[PDB]
PDB file of N, CA and C and ligand atoms in Angstrom:
ATOM      1  N   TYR Z   1     147.354 307.757 -24.389  1.00 39.43           N
ATOM      2  CA  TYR Z   1     148.103 308.706 -24.586  1.00 39.43           C
ATOM      3  C   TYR Z   1     148.393 309.020 -25.922  1.00 39.43           C
ATOM      4  N   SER Z   2     147.770 308.474 -26.879  1.00 41.04           N
ATOM      5  CA  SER Z   2     147.591 308.285 -28.385  1.00 41.04           C
ATOM      6  C   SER Z   2     146.602 309.351 -28.552  1.00 41.04           C
ATOM      7  N   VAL Z   3     145.203 309.604 -28.300  1.00 44.73           N
ATOM      8  CA  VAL Z   3     144.475 310.668 -28.472  1.00 44.73           C
ATOM      9  C   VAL Z   3     145.031 311.767 -28.032  1.00 44.73           C
ATOM     10  N   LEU Z   4     145.771 311.962 -26.906  1.00 42.82           N
ATOM     11  CA  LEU Z   4     146.927 313.172 -26.527  1.00 42.82           C
ATOM     12  C   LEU Z   4     147.894 313.538 -27.810  1.00 42.82           C
ATOM     13  N   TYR Z   5     148.450 312.422 -28.283  1.00 44.93           N
ATOM     14  CA  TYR Z   5     149.452 312.356 -29.370  1.00 44.93           C
ATOM     15  C   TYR Z   5     148.879 312.674 -30.662  1.00 44.93           C
ATOM     16  N   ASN Z   6     147.900 311.970 -31.058  1.00 42.14           N
ATOM     17  CA  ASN Z   6     147.443 311.494 -32.700  1.00 42.14           C
ATOM     18  C   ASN Z   6     146.005 312.662 -32.843  1.00 42.14           C
ATOM     19  N   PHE Z   7     145.235 312.475 -31.728  1.00 39.09           N
ATOM     20  CA  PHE Z   7     144.082 313.311 -32.191  1.00 39.09           C
ATOM     21  C   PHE Z   7     144.247 314.961 -31.939  1.00 39.09           C
ATOM     22  N   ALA Z   8     143.598 315.613 -33.023  1.00 39.45           N
ATOM     23  CA  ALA Z   8     143.689 316.923 -32.644  1.00 39.45           C
ATOM     24  C   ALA Z   8     145.349 317.441 -33.346  1.00 39.45           C
ATOM     25  N   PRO Z   9     145.509 318.463 -33.799  1.00 37.55           N
ATOM     26  CA  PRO Z   9     146.708 319.023 -33.953  1.00 37.55           C
ATOM     27  C   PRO Z   9     147.520 319.170 -32.950  1.00 37.55           C
ATOM     28  N   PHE Z  10     146.968 319.207 -31.692  1.00 37.30           N
ATOM     29  CA  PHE Z  10     147.810 319.763 -30.541  1.00 37.30           C
ATOM     30  C   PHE Z  10     148.459 320.781 -30.969  1.00 37.30           C
ATOM     31  N   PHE Z  11     148.269 321.763 -31.260  1.00 36.23           N
ATOM     32  CA  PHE Z  11     148.976 323.012 -31.536  1.00 36.23           C
ATOM     33  C   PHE Z  11     150.157 323.222 -30.192  1.00 36.23           C
ATOM     34  N   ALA Z  12     149.291 323.247 -28.948  1.00 35.85           N
ATOM     35  CA  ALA Z  12     150.282 323.451 -28.098  1.00 35.85           C
ATOM     36  C   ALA Z  12     150.677 321.779 -27.528  1.00 35.85           C
ATOM     37  N   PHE Z  13     152.109 321.806 -27.071  1.00 32.14           N
ATOM     38  CA  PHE Z  13     152.347 320.601 -26.458  1.00 32.14           C
ATOM     39  C   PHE Z  13     153.703 320.517 -25.384  1.00 32.14           C
ATOM     40  N   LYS Z  14     153.825 322.030 -25.254  1.00 33.28           N
ATOM     41  CA  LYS Z  14     154.886 322.514 -24.276  1.00 33.28           C
ATOM     42  C   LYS Z  14     154.670 322.193 -23.071  1.00 33.28           C
ATOM     43  N   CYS Z  15     155.893 321.301 -22.382  1.00 29.60           N
ATOM     44  CA  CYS Z  15     155.469 321.356 -20.834  1.00 29.60           C
ATOM     45  C   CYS Z  15     156.915 321.078 -20.292  1.00 29.60           C
ATOM     46  N   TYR Z  16     157.080 321.761 -18.748  1.00 27.68           N
ATOM     47  CA  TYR Z  16     158.404 321.773 -18.415  1.00 27.68           C
ATOM     48  C   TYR Z  16     158.830 320.588 -16.809  1.00 27.68           C
ATOM     49  N   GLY Z  17     157.582 320.262 -16.744  1.00 27.91           N
ATOM     50  CA  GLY Z  17     157.483 319.267 -15.502  1.00 27.91           C
ATOM     51  C   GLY Z  17     158.142 317.781 -15.564  1.00 27.91           C
ATOM     52  N   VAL Z  18     156.978 317.293 -16.270  1.00 25.11           N
ATOM     53  CA  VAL Z  18     157.449 315.782 -17.009  1.00 25.11           C
ATOM     54  C   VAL Z  18     157.333 315.784 -18.502  1.00 25.11           C
ATOM     55  N   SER Z  19     158.251 314.978 -18.796  1.00 27.46           N
ATOM     56  CA  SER Z  19     158.547 314.549 -20.395  1.00 27.46           C
ATOM     57  C   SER Z  19     157.346 313.958 -20.732  1.00 27.46           C
ATOM     58  N   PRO Z  20     156.781 314.418 -21.548  1.00 30.05           N
ATOM     59  CA  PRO Z  20     155.777 313.751 -22.286  1.00 30.05           C
ATOM     60  C   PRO Z  20     156.001 312.551 -23.241  1.00 30.05           C
ATOM     61  N   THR Z  21     157.271 312.239 -23.483  1.00 31.16           N
ATOM     62  CA  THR Z  21     157.728 311.289 -24.160  1.00 31.16           C
ATOM     63  C   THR Z  21     157.729 309.767 -23.305  1.00 31.16           C
ATOM     64  N   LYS Z  22     158.555 309.982 -22.213  1.00 32.99           N
ATOM     65  CA  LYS Z  22     158.581 309.040 -21.045  1.00 32.99           C
ATOM     66  C   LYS Z  22     157.247 309.100 -20.069  1.00 32.99           C
ATOM     67  N   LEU Z  23     156.143 308.584 -20.579  1.00 31.07           N
ATOM     68  CA  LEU Z  23     155.100 309.167 -19.774  1.00 31.07           C
ATOM     69  C   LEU Z  23     153.854 308.031 -19.849  1.00 31.07           C
ATOM     70  N   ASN Z  24     153.943 307.043 -20.944  1.00 30.98           N
ATOM     71  CA  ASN Z  24     153.065 306.094 -20.958  1.00 30.98           C
ATOM     72  C   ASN Z  24     153.185 305.033 -20.010  1.00 30.98           C
ATOM     73  N   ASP Z  25     154.418 304.605 -19.660  1.00 34.20           N
ATOM     74  CA  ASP Z  25     154.391 303.872 -18.337  1.00 34.20           C
ATOM     75  C   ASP Z  25     154.350 304.450 -16.989  1.00 34.20           C
ATOM     76  N   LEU Z  26     154.508 305.649 -17.075  1.00 37.65           N
ATOM     77  CA  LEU Z  26     154.461 306.502 -15.558  1.00 37.65           C
ATOM     78  C   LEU Z  26     152.919 306.626 -15.405  1.00 37.65           C
ATOM     79  N   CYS Z  27     152.824 306.314 -13.835  1.00 37.05           N
ATOM     80  CA  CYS Z  27     151.390 305.994 -13.453  1.00 37.05           C
ATOM     81  C   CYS Z  27     151.107 307.012 -12.224  1.00 37.05           C
ATOM     82  N   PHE Z  28     149.690 307.858 -12.156  1.00 36.87           N
ATOM     83  CA  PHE Z  28     149.703 308.575 -11.076  1.00 36.87           C
ATOM     84  C   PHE Z  28     148.370 307.863 -10.617  1.00 36.87           C
ATOM     85  N   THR Z  29     147.617 308.453  -9.940  1.00 33.93           N
ATOM     86  CA  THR Z  29     146.230 308.578  -9.281  1.00 33.93           C
ATOM     87  C   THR Z  29     145.192 309.189  -9.686  1.00 33.93           C
ATOM     88  N   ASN Z  30     145.341 310.633  -9.668  1.00 33.27           N
ATOM     89  CA  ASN Z  30     144.700 311.744  -9.763  1.00 33.27           C
ATOM     90  C   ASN Z  30     145.273 313.026 -10.584  1.00 33.27           C
ATOM     91  N   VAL Z  31     144.796 313.239 -11.591  1.00 34.66           N
ATOM     92  CA  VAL Z  31     145.432 314.640 -12.892  1.00 34.66           C
ATOM     93  C   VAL Z  31     143.854 315.173 -12.739  1.00 34.66           C
ATOM     94  N   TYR Z  32     144.549 316.739 -12.359  1.00 35.86           N
ATOM     95  CA  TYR Z  32     143.635 317.937 -12.340  1.00 35.86           C
ATOM     96  C   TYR Z  32     143.547 318.532 -13.848  1.00 35.86           C
ATOM     97  N   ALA Z  33     142.764 317.942 -14.724  1.00 32.77           N
ATOM     98  CA  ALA Z  33     142.618 318.683 -16.083  1.00 32.77           C
ATOM     99  C   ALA Z  33     141.726 319.693 -16.203  1.00 32.77           C
ATOM    100  N   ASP Z  34     141.747 320.951 -16.697  1.00 30.00           N
ATOM    101  CA  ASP Z  34     140.901 322.053 -16.808  1.00 30.00           C
ATOM    102  C   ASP Z  34     140.916 322.433 -18.237  1.00 30.00           C
ATOM    103  N   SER Z  35     139.505 322.732 -18.488  1.00 29.33           N
ATOM    104  CA  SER Z  35     139.422 322.932 -20.101  1.00 29.33           C
ATOM    105  C   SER Z  35     138.645 324.323 -20.245  1.00 29.33           C
ATOM    106  N   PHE Z  36     139.337 324.851 -21.148  1.00 31.84           N
ATOM    107  CA  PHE Z  36     138.875 326.289 -21.522  1.00 31.84           C
ATOM    108  C   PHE Z  36     139.192 326.583 -22.988  1.00 31.84           C
ATOM    109  N   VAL Z  37     138.710 327.926 -23.277  1.00 28.18           N
ATOM    110  CA  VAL Z  37     138.697 328.176 -24.961  1.00 28.18           C
ATOM    111  C   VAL Z  37     139.657 329.385 -24.935  1.00 28.18           C
ATOM    112  N   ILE Z  38     140.858 329.971 -25.544  1.00 32.95           N
ATOM    113  CA  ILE Z  38     141.171 331.271 -25.813  1.00 32.95           C
ATOM    114  C   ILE Z  38     141.598 331.314 -27.156  1.00 32.95           C
ATOM    115  N   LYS Z  39     141.976 332.076 -27.372  1.00 32.64           N
ATOM    116  CA  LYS Z  39     142.634 332.703 -29.004  1.00 32.64           C
ATOM    117  C   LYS Z  39     143.965 332.472 -29.320  1.00 32.64           C
ATOM    118  N   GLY Z  40     144.706 332.461 -30.168  1.00 30.07           N
ATOM    119  CA  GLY Z  40     146.087 331.907 -30.334  1.00 30.07           C
ATOM    120  C   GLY Z  40     147.171 332.247 -29.376  1.00 30.07           C
ATOM    121  N   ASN Z  41     147.186 333.826 -29.212  1.00 28.40           N
ATOM    122  CA  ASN Z  41     148.138 334.316 -28.058  1.00 28.40           C
ATOM    123  C   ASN Z  41     148.235 333.779 -26.975  1.00 28.40           C
ATOM    124  N   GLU Z  42     146.635 333.704 -26.417  1.00 29.94           N
ATOM    125  CA  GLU Z  42     146.687 333.195 -25.127  1.00 29.94           C
ATOM    126  C   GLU Z  42     147.532 331.958 -24.726  1.00 29.94           C
ATOM    127  N   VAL Z  43     147.072 330.972 -25.769  1.00 27.18           N
ATOM    128  CA  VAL Z  43     147.853 329.620 -25.625  1.00 27.18           C
ATOM    129  C   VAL Z  43     149.200 329.853 -25.686  1.00 27.18           C
ATOM    130  N   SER Z  44     150.255 330.489 -26.134  1.00 27.58           N
ATOM    131  CA  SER Z  44     151.409 330.663 -26.080  1.00 27.58           C
ATOM    132  C   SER Z  44     151.484 331.324 -24.695  1.00 27.58           C
ATOM    133  N   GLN Z  45     150.886 332.422 -24.410  1.00 28.98           N
ATOM    134  CA  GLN Z  45     150.883 333.223 -22.797  1.00 28.98           C
ATOM    135  C   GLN Z  45     150.837 331.955 -21.424  1.00 28.98           C
ATOM    136  N   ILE Z  46     150.162 330.694 -21.941  1.00 28.72           N
ATOM    137  CA  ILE Z  46     149.884 330.036 -20.672  1.00 28.72           C
ATOM    138  C   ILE Z  46     151.406 329.507 -20.581  1.00 28.72           C
ATOM    139  N   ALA Z  47     151.842 329.773 -19.646  1.00 29.55           N
ATOM    140  CA  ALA Z  47     153.057 328.997 -18.694  1.00 29.55           C
ATOM    141  C   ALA Z  47     153.190 329.290 -17.417  1.00 29.55           C
ATOM    142  N   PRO Z  48     154.085 328.712 -16.896  1.00 26.92           N
ATOM    143  CA  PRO Z  48     154.192 328.927 -15.324  1.00 26.92           C
ATOM    144  C   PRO Z  48     155.288 330.232 -15.213  1.00 26.92           C
ATOM    145  N   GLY Z  49     154.735 331.144 -14.296  1.00 29.32           N
ATOM    146  CA  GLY Z  49     155.674 332.164 -13.977  1.00 29.32           C
ATOM    147  C   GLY Z  49     155.888 333.419 -14.967  1.00 29.32           C
TER     148      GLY Z  49
ATOM    149  N   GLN Q   1     171.009 306.030  -8.570  1.00 28.58           N
ATOM    150  CA  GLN Q   1     169.804 306.642  -8.468  1.00 28.58           C
ATOM    151  C   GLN Q   1     169.258 306.797  -9.767  1.00 28.58           C
ATOM    152  N   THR Q   2     167.756 306.747  -9.579  1.00 23.91           N
ATOM    153  CA  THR Q   2     166.744 306.754 -11.173  1.00 23.91           C
ATOM    154  C   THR Q   2     165.826 307.662 -10.926  1.00 23.91           C
ATOM    155  N   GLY Q   3     165.557 308.486 -12.011  1.00 22.09           N
ATOM    156  CA  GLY Q   3     165.191 309.505 -12.355  1.00 22.09           C
ATOM    157  C   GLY Q   3     165.268 310.395 -13.555  1.00 22.09           C
ATOM    158  N   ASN Q   4     165.616 311.607 -13.960  1.00 23.14           N
ATOM    159  CA  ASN Q   4     165.947 312.196 -15.056  1.00 23.14           C
ATOM    160  C   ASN Q   4     167.031 312.909 -15.254  1.00 23.14           C
ATOM    161  N   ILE Q   5     167.387 313.940 -14.193  1.00 21.15           N
ATOM    162  CA  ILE Q   5     168.899 314.383 -14.426  1.00 21.15           C
ATOM    163  C   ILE Q   5     170.110 313.423 -13.742  1.00 21.15           C
ATOM    164  N   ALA Q   6     169.604 312.756 -12.769  1.00 20.27           N
ATOM    165  CA  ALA Q   6     170.634 311.650 -12.711  1.00 20.27           C
ATOM    166  C   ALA Q   6     170.750 310.458 -13.250  1.00 20.27           C
ATOM    167  N   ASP Q   7     169.613 310.205 -14.454  1.00 20.52           N
ATOM    168  CA  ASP Q   7     169.690 309.233 -15.490  1.00 20.52           C
ATOM    169  C   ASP Q   7     170.015 309.704 -16.706  1.00 20.52           C
ATOM    170  N   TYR Q   8     170.061 311.205 -17.207  1.00 21.74           N
ATOM    171  CA  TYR Q   8     170.639 311.455 -18.216  1.00 21.74           C
ATOM    172  C   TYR Q   8     171.762 312.553 -18.440  1.00 21.74           C
ATOM    173  N   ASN Q   9     172.120 313.018 -17.239  1.00 20.92           N
ATOM    174  CA  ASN Q   9     172.886 314.170 -17.377  1.00 20.92           C
ATOM    175  C   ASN Q   9     174.485 313.607 -16.410  1.00 20.92           C
ATOM    176  N   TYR Q  10     173.921 313.172 -15.388  1.00 18.80           N
ATOM    177  CA  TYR Q  10     175.057 312.353 -14.317  1.00 18.80           C
ATOM    178  C   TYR Q  10     174.848 311.538 -13.529  1.00 18.80           C
ATOM    179  N   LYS Q  11     175.637 310.477 -13.965  1.00 19.03           N
ATOM    180  CA  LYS Q  11     175.278 309.062 -12.967  1.00 19.03           C
ATOM    181  C   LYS Q  11     176.374 308.894 -12.052  1.00 19.03           C
ATOM    182  N   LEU Q  12     176.309 308.995 -10.760  1.00 20.52           N
ATOM    183  CA  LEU Q  12     176.958 308.406  -9.969  1.00 20.52           C
ATOM    184  C   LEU Q  12     177.436 307.062 -10.285  1.00 20.52           C
ATOM    185  N   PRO Q  13     178.597 306.502  -9.809  1.00 20.63           N
ATOM    186  CA  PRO Q  13     179.095 304.789 -10.177  1.00 20.63           C
ATOM    187  C   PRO Q  13     178.468 304.502  -8.776  1.00 20.63           C
ATOM    188  N   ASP Q  14     177.675 303.232  -9.242  1.00 20.28           N
ATOM    189  CA  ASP Q  14     177.020 302.441  -7.909  1.00 20.28           C
ATOM    190  C   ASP Q  14     177.889 302.123  -7.074  1.00 20.28           C
ATOM    191  N   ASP Q  15     179.349 301.803  -7.042  1.00 20.70           N
ATOM    192  CA  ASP Q  15     180.518 301.512  -6.351  1.00 20.70           C
ATOM    193  C   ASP Q  15     181.421 302.819  -6.141  1.00 20.70           C
ATOM    194  N   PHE Q  16     180.431 303.878  -5.816  1.00 20.95           N
ATOM    195  CA  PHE Q  16     181.444 305.136  -5.432  1.00 20.95           C
ATOM    196  C   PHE Q  16     182.030 305.268  -4.547  1.00 20.95           C
ATOM    197  N   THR Q  17     183.296 305.717  -4.656  1.00 23.75           N
ATOM    198  CA  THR Q  17     184.010 306.064  -3.278  1.00 23.75           C
ATOM    199  C   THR Q  17     184.575 307.345  -3.218  1.00 23.75           C
ATOM    200  N   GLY Q  18     184.450 308.213  -1.936  1.00 23.55           N
ATOM    201  CA  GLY Q  18     184.621 309.410  -1.944  1.00 23.55           C
ATOM    202  C   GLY Q  18     183.857 310.398  -1.251  1.00 23.55           C
ATOM    203  N   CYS Q  19     183.851 311.745  -1.400  1.00 20.76           N
ATOM    204  CA  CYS Q  19     182.848 312.567  -0.565  1.00 20.76           C
ATOM    205  C   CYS Q  19     182.091 313.412  -1.583  1.00 20.76           C
ATOM    206  N   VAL Q  20     181.323 313.708  -1.065  1.00 19.25           N
ATOM    207  CA  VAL Q  20     180.365 315.022  -1.670  1.00 19.25           C
ATOM    208  C   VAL Q  20     180.119 316.205  -1.216  1.00 19.25           C
ATOM    209  N   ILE Q  21     180.024 317.153  -1.460  1.00 18.99           N
ATOM    210  CA  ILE Q  21     180.128 318.595  -1.092  1.00 18.99           C
ATOM    211  C   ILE Q  21     178.890 319.190  -1.550  1.00 18.99           C
ATOM    212  N   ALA Q  22     177.893 319.607  -0.587  1.00 16.57           N
ATOM    213  CA  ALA Q  22     176.924 320.412  -0.928  1.00 16.57           C
ATOM    214  C   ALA Q  22     176.500 321.491  -0.123  1.00 16.57           C
ATOM    215  N   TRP Q  23     176.297 322.564  -0.588  1.00 19.92           N
ATOM    216  CA  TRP Q  23     176.132 323.791  -0.090  1.00 19.92           C
ATOM    217  C   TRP Q  23     175.269 324.702  -0.895  1.00 19.92           C
ATOM    218  N   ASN Q  24     174.231 325.309  -0.423  1.00 23.26           N
ATOM    219  CA  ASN Q  24     173.350 326.307  -1.170  1.00 23.26           C
ATOM    220  C   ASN Q  24     173.845 327.525  -1.567  1.00 23.26           C
ATOM    221  N   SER Q  25     173.828 327.944  -2.991  1.00 20.97           N
ATOM    222  CA  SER Q  25     174.315 328.946  -3.229  1.00 20.97           C
ATOM    223  C   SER Q  25     173.242 330.031  -4.234  1.00 20.97           C
ATOM    224  N   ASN Q  26     172.286 330.677  -3.491  1.00 20.66           N
ATOM    225  CA  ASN Q  26     171.200 331.237  -3.949  1.00 20.66           C
ATOM    226  C   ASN Q  26     171.808 332.616  -4.568  1.00 20.66           C
ATOM    227  N   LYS Q  27     172.547 333.463  -4.102  1.00 22.50           N
ATOM    228  CA  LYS Q  27     172.857 334.695  -4.780  1.00 22.50           C
ATOM    229  C   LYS Q  27     174.024 334.523  -5.816  1.00 22.50           C
ATOM    230  N   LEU Q  28     174.961 333.508  -5.531  1.00 21.81           N
ATOM    231  CA  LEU Q  28     175.766 333.305  -6.774  1.00 21.81           C
ATOM    232  C   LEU Q  28     175.533 332.725  -7.959  1.00 21.81           C
ATOM    233  N   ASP Q  29     173.932 332.300  -7.982  1.00 22.86           N
ATOM    234  CA  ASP Q  29     173.500 331.237  -8.949  1.00 22.86           C
ATOM    235  C   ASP Q  29     172.143 332.291  -9.419  1.00 22.86           C
ATOM    236  N   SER Q  30     171.502 332.729  -8.793  1.00 23.15           N
ATOM    237  CA  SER Q  30     170.022 333.276  -9.321  1.00 23.15           C
ATOM    238  C   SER Q  30     170.221 334.737  -9.240  1.00 23.15           C
ATOM    239  N   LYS Q  31     169.372 335.175 -10.057  1.00 25.05           N
ATOM    240  CA  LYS Q  31     169.091 336.613 -10.083  1.00 25.05           C
ATOM    241  C   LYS Q  31     167.603 337.249 -10.359  1.00 25.05           C
ATOM    242  N   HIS Q  32     167.309 338.329 -10.160  1.00 22.85           N
ATOM    243  CA  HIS Q  32     166.054 339.052 -10.129  1.00 22.85           C
ATOM    244  C   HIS Q  32     165.385 338.457 -11.598  1.00 22.85           C
ATOM    245  N   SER Q  33     164.370 338.325 -11.480  1.00 23.64           N
ATOM    246  CA  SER Q  33     163.635 338.449 -12.951  1.00 23.64           C
ATOM    247  C   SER Q  33     163.950 337.137 -13.795  1.00 23.64           C
ATOM    248  N   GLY Q  34     164.404 335.982 -13.100  1.00 24.87           N
ATOM    249  CA  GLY Q  34     164.988 334.826 -13.912  1.00 24.87           C
ATOM    250  C   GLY Q  34     165.999 334.650 -14.212  1.00 24.87           C
ATOM    251  N   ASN Q  35     166.900 333.497 -13.732  1.00 26.80           N
ATOM    252  CA  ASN Q  35     168.106 333.368 -14.483  1.00 26.80           C
ATOM    253  C   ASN Q  35     168.210 331.534 -14.810  1.00 26.80           C
ATOM    254  N   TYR Q  36     167.910 331.275 -16.183  1.00 26.75           N
ATOM    255  CA  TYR Q  36     168.102 330.226 -16.691  1.00 26.75           C
ATOM    256  C   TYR Q  36     169.137 329.994 -18.060  1.00 26.75           C
ATOM    257  N   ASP Q  37     170.226 330.491 -17.586  1.00 28.05           N
ATOM    258  CA  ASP Q  37     171.351 330.297 -18.175  1.00 28.05           C
ATOM    259  C   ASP Q  37     172.118 328.796 -18.017  1.00 28.05           C
ATOM    260  N   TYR Q  38     171.779 328.015 -16.728  1.00 30.78           N
ATOM    261  CA  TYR Q  38     172.035 326.696 -16.641  1.00 30.78           C
ATOM    262  C   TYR Q  38     170.993 325.809 -17.444  1.00 30.78           C
ATOM    263  N   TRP Q  39     171.200 324.519 -17.870  1.00 31.39           N
ATOM    264  CA  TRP Q  39     170.718 323.814 -18.845  1.00 31.39           C
ATOM    265  C   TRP Q  39     170.746 322.082 -18.238  1.00 31.39           C
ATOM    266  N   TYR Q  40     169.440 321.750 -18.102  1.00 29.98           N
ATOM    267  CA  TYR Q  40     169.802 320.421 -17.664  1.00 29.98           C
ATOM    268  C   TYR Q  40     168.885 319.530 -18.961  1.00 29.98           C
ATOM    269  N   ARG Q  41     169.350 318.314 -19.162  1.00 29.22           N
ATOM    270  CA  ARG Q  41     168.939 317.539 -20.240  1.00 29.22           C
ATOM    271  C   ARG Q  41     167.804 316.219 -19.874  1.00 29.22           C
ATOM    272  N   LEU Q  42     166.525 316.483 -19.867  1.00 31.65           N
ATOM    273  CA  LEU Q  42     165.838 315.741 -19.453  1.00 31.65           C
ATOM    274  C   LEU Q  42     165.220 314.791 -20.502  1.00 31.65           C
ATOM    275  N   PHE Q  43     165.573 315.054 -21.766  1.00 27.75           N
ATOM    276  CA  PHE Q  43     165.377 314.198 -22.910  1.00 27.75           C
ATOM    277  C   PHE Q  43     166.396 313.422 -23.187  1.00 27.75           C
ATOM    278  N   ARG Q  44     166.287 312.090 -23.110  1.00 35.09           N
ATOM    279  CA  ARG Q  44     167.631 310.965 -23.456  1.00 35.09           C
ATOM    280  C   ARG Q  44     167.136 309.939 -24.395  1.00 35.09           C
ATOM    281  N   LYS Q  45     167.685 308.993 -24.854  1.00 33.71           N
ATOM    282  CA  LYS Q  45     167.351 307.950 -25.352  1.00 33.71           C
ATOM    283  C   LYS Q  45     167.156 307.004 -24.251  1.00 33.71           C
ATOM    284  N   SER Q  46     168.405 306.856 -23.404  1.00 34.57           N
ATOM    285  CA  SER Q  46     168.002 305.964 -22.490  1.00 34.57           C
ATOM    286  C   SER Q  46     168.839 306.358 -21.356  1.00 34.57           C
ATOM    287  N   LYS Q  47     169.405 305.611 -20.383  1.00 34.09           N
ATOM    288  CA  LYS Q  47     169.508 305.565 -19.030  1.00 34.09           C
ATOM    289  C   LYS Q  47     171.139 305.949 -19.339  1.00 34.09           C
ATOM    290  N   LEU Q  48     171.821 306.860 -18.445  1.00 32.75           N
ATOM    291  CA  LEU Q  48     173.547 307.099 -18.480  1.00 32.75           C
ATOM    292  C   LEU Q  48     174.063 306.416 -17.822  1.00 32.75           C
ATOM    293  N   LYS Q  49     175.315 305.574 -18.456  1.00 32.34           N
ATOM    294  CA  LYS Q  49     176.406 305.071 -17.701  1.00 32.34           C
ATOM    295  C   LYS Q  49     176.940 305.960 -16.695  1.00 32.34           C
TER     296      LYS Q  49
HETATM  297  C1  LIG Y   1     178.614 308.128 -27.203  1.00 31.88           C
HETATM  298  O1  LIG Y   1     179.118 307.006 -26.936  1.00 31.88           O
HETATM  299  C2  LIG Y   1     178.103 305.845 -26.671  1.00 31.88           C
HETATM  300  C3  LIG Y   1     178.972 304.411 -26.522  1.00 31.88           C
HETATM  301  O2  LIG Y   1     178.868 303.892 -25.531  1.00 31.88           O
HETATM  302  C4  LIG Y   1     176.939 305.763 -27.197  1.00 31.88           C
HETATM  303  O3  LIG Y   1     175.810 306.231 -26.600  1.00 31.88           O
HETATM  304  C5  LIG Y   1     174.678 305.126 -26.510  1.00 31.88           C
HETATM  305  O4  LIG Y   1     174.356 304.786 -28.052  1.00 31.88           O
HETATM  306  C6  LIG Y   1     172.817 304.140 -27.828  1.00 31.88           C
HETATM  307  C7  LIG Y   1     172.918 304.174 -29.501  1.00 31.88           C
HETATM  308  O5  LIG Y   1     173.921 304.068 -30.293  1.00 31.88           O
HETATM  309  C8  LIG Y   1     171.710 304.307 -27.077  1.00 31.88           C
HETATM  310  O6  LIG Y   1     170.934 303.178 -27.411  1.00 31.88           O
HETATM  311  C9  LIG Y   1     172.462 304.604 -25.497  1.00 31.88           C
HETATM  312  O7  LIG Y   1     171.257 305.004 -25.022  1.00 31.88           O
HETATM  313  C10 LIG Y   1     173.464 305.478 -25.451  1.00 31.88           C
HETATM  314  N1  LIG Y   1     174.260 305.594 -24.290  1.00 31.88           N
HETATM  315  C11 LIG Y   1     174.878 306.626 -23.628  1.00 31.88           C
HETATM  316  C12 LIG Y   1     175.507 305.841 -22.382  1.00 31.88           C
HETATM  317  O8  LIG Y   1     174.736 307.329 -24.343  1.00 31.88           O
HETATM  318  C13 LIG Y   1     176.902 306.835 -28.682  1.00 31.88           C
HETATM  319  O9  LIG Y   1     177.752 306.235 -29.442  1.00 31.88           O
HETATM  320  C14 LIG Y   1     177.148 308.063 -28.277  1.00 31.88           C
HETATM  321  N2  LIG Y   1     176.304 308.892 -27.680  1.00 31.88           N
HETATM  322  C15 LIG Y   1     175.789 310.018 -28.064  1.00 31.88           C
HETATM  323  C16 LIG Y   1     174.597 310.603 -27.682  1.00 31.88           C
HETATM  324  O10 LIG Y   1     175.984 310.563 -29.385  1.00 31.88           O
END
């Protein structure tokens, strides 16, 4: 998760389900990652509900 | 119990004695268009005694 932490300015880091700090040891099998490009305000508009 | 809420906010003692009362209260705790007056801390340095 260093690349997620150090690489790129990571302008958006907000999330509500699982803490991004107590995550290095936490371990799953599959993760659904989707990539797309938007402007500044849509990044903020990205949210649940 | 292990997790986030039971690990940072409220930890029941291992040698607990007594009773636990549970009942769903949707009308008295939720309202239309969101109700996030309540707060639970999922970020803590360590587990809670
Ligand atoms: C509340 O007092 C307790 C003393 O028992 C302390 O809480 C611990 O603080 C250490 C660091 O000083 C942490 O590593 C532990 O994880 C803490 N444990 C708990 C259960 O909080 C501290 O002095 C006070 N805690 C806070 C958050 O101010």
